[PDB]
């Protein structure tokens, strides 16, 4: 039966500052197939406190990244996926941010 639905394997980050690559995240289901074939990503009240979804060609990973320069640490993006549709309600897949460049850092 499709009882679950899709959810994001990360579930904190260490974000940069002067320019933060993507926040590599990815998709598991725990339905046997086809109940976990191919997704939809949604970014649901946050869906510009600037963020901004993408998958990875080979289906598994989303690629999320900002779209405006913003602040110093602590900070959640509600994430929302669906396989057959069933929806998944993500959630909070939180962010801290500290000082910097452009790589992924250890933080503070
Ligand atoms: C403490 O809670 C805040 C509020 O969401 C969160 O940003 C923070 O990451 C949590 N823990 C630490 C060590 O900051
Ligand atoms: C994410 O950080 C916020 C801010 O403190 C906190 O309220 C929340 O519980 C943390 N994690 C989730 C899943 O909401
Ligand atoms: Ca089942
Ligand atoms: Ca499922």
Same mark, same amino acid.
């Given at each position: 039966?499709?009882?679950?639905?899709?959810?994001?394997?990360?579930?904190?980050?260490?974000?940069?500052?002067?320019?933060?690559?993507?926040?590599? /995240?990815?998709?598991?289901?725990?339905?046997?197939?086809?109940?976990? !074939?191919?997704?939809? *990503?949604? =970014? #649901?009240?946050?869906?510009?406190?600037?963020?901004?979804?993408?998958?990875?060609?080979?289906?598994?990973?989303? /690629?999320?990244?900002?779209?405006?320069?913003?602040?110093?640490?602590? !900070?959640?993006?509600? *994430?929302? =996926? #669906?396989?057959?549709?069933?929806?998944?309600?993500?959630?909070?897949?939180?962010?801290?941010?500290?000082?910097?460049?452009?790589?992924?850092?250890?933080?503070?």
């Amino acid at each position: 039966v499709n009882d679950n639905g899709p959810v994001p394997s990360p579930r904190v980050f260490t974000m940069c500052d002067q320019n933060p690559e993507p926040q590599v /995240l990815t998709i598991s289901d725990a339905d046997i197939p086809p109940n976990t !074939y191919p997704y939809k *990503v949604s =970014l #649901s009240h946050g869906s510009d406190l600037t963020w901004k979804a993408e998958l990875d060609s080979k289906g598994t990973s989303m /690629l999320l990244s900002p779209t405006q320069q913003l602040k110093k640490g602590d !900070y959640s993006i509600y *994430v929302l =996926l #669906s396989d057959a549709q069933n929806n998944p309600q993500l959630t909070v897949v939180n962010a801290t941010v500290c000082s910097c460049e452009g790589k992924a850092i250890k933080c503070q």
